[PDB]
Design an enzyme around this catalytic site. Sequence first.
Site, PDB file in Angstrom:
ATOM      1  N   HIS A  43      24.276   2.830 -22.190  1.00  0.00           N
ATOM      2  CA  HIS A  43      23.732   3.504 -21.426  1.00  0.00           C
ATOM      3  C   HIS A  43      23.119   4.866 -21.709  1.00  0.00           C
ATOM      4  CE1 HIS A  43      27.175   5.895 -20.055  1.00  0.00           C
ATOM      5  NE2 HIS A  43      26.202   6.936 -20.021  1.00  0.00           N
ATOM      6  N   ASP A  99      29.500  -1.702 -22.006  1.00  0.00           N
ATOM      7  CA  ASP A  99      28.753  -0.373 -22.359  1.00  0.00           C
ATOM      8  C   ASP A  99      28.991   0.280 -23.573  1.00  0.00           C
ATOM      9  OD1 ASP A  99      26.968   1.577 -21.760  1.00  0.00           O
ATOM     10  OD2 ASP A  99      28.148   2.718 -20.358  1.00  0.00           O
ATOM     11  N   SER A 198      28.737  11.865 -21.197  1.00  0.00           N
ATOM     12  CA  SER A 198      28.806  10.070 -21.413  1.00  0.00           C
ATOM     13  C   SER A 198      28.328   9.782 -22.671  1.00  0.00           C
ATOM     14  CB  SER A 198      27.957   9.530 -20.355  1.00  0.00           C
ATOM     15  OG  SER A 198      26.628   9.343 -20.684  1.00  0.00           O
TER      16      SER A 198
END
Lengths: 252, 13, 26
Positions: A43, A99, A198
């Site tokens: 992502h 992911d 992230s």
Amino acid sequence: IVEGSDAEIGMSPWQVMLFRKSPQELLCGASLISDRWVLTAAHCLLYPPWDKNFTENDLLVRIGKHSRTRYERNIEKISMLEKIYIHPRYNWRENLDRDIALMKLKKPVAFSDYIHPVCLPDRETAASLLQAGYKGRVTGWGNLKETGQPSVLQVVNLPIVERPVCKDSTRIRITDNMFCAGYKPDEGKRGDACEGDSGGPFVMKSPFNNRWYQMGIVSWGEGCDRDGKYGFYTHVFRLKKWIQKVIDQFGE
Amino acid sequence: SDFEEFSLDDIEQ
Amino acid sequence: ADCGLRPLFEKKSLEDKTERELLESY
């Protein structure tokens, strides 16, 4: 990181910053698994709902950093990417299942006191450390608050939570390739990953060979540090074969 | 911006 | 091969300020 502390120098030597050439901007965290390979969340590169689709050319990798914003003159190493690799069954359409992405550095990087690779877990390491109640460590330069930016690398220590509680906290469909982490409201100790963290690593220290292993990848959450909410991470062990695969097929 | 500049001579290692 | 052994902590037998919190959870 929300409710974290300033890291110590050389505390997370595998920590990498994902950096946008122009505008210059922190995209996400990542980690160094070898002198030529970096691991991050898919992502961070590809996210259509938001027209996100980064190519090799659009980014720079920064290794050996402490300060977010300063160019760490004889500490940090900045590299170009040779190639990106996204898991083919990465599910951006519904839950960010799978992911994970690999980034192949144009040239190998030299280890130093501030630059060193983390270990990938073995089945046995996974089995013994991935237990509800066992704490892992998250590090990054993301937001300090859901709604700011640290000066230095932050760190937080969080406990893995039981699957059911994970499941019961969201309307999103959890898979076996995910695990969640955080303190429970009754626990009255807090912390979490936040915006910009992230793609960074969730690591654990083996009490047996006393090596640091990356168990997870900072994946998604609902807000930052919300009560009855948890952070969700990519289960690195479950995706090992895909990792071995692309390294064996195209690299180092 | 925010970010302190580096040269393209600081790049590739 | 040398993965996960930190030049400023493991390699000199120094421990970081919160690593004990981890080992104690185990």
